[PDB]
């Protein structure tokens, strides 16, 4: 029935016979996946967000909102954390250490 299933779904992408649209090599675009390897399932028929959204949590967020990952936790943008002697705070979806005199 053409069903995407794919929880509340954003955009509708297919892929074609060959898999133009999502060129076989693409079927899922999150935060997680952005840059990291992508999952088997999503390139046929299936729901995600808009280019410069991110799949998140069933919900969509932009990049520089994403959420970040430390310690098997995850934080926020401009969220701080303590790391030994140094400190990091999410900021591009990548942490940024100060790197200080540790104390």
């Given at each position: 029935?053409?069903?995407?299933?794919?929880?509340?779904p954003?955009?509708?992408?297919?892929?074609?016979?060959?898999?133009?649209?999502?060129?076989?090599?693409?079927?899922?675009?999150?935060?997680?996946?952005?840059?990291?390897?992508?999952?088997?399932?999503?390139?046929?028929?299936?729901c995600?967000?808009?280019?410069?959204?991110?799949?998140?949590?069933?919900?969509?967020?932009?990049?520089?909102?994403?959420?970040?990952?430390?310690?098997?936790?995850?934080?926020?943008?401009?969220?701080?954390?303590?790391?030994?002697?140094?400190?990091?705070?999410?900021?591009?979806?990548?942490?940024?250490?100060?790197?200080?005199?540790?104390?």
């Amino acid at each position: 029935g053409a069903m995407g299933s794919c929880r509340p779904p954003m955009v509708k992408l297919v892929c074609p016979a060959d898999n133009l649209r999502a060129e076989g090599l693409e079927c899922t675009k999150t935060c997680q996946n952005y840059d990291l390897e992508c999952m088997s399932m999503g390139c046929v028929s299936g729901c995600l967000c808009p280019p410069g959204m991110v799949r998140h949590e069933n919900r969509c967020v932009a990049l520089e909102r994403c959420p970040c990952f430390h310690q098997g936790k995850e934080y926020a943008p401009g969220e701080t954390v303590k790391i030994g002697c140094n400190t990091c705070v999410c900021r591009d979806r990548k942490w940024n250490c100060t790197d200080h005199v540790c104390d």
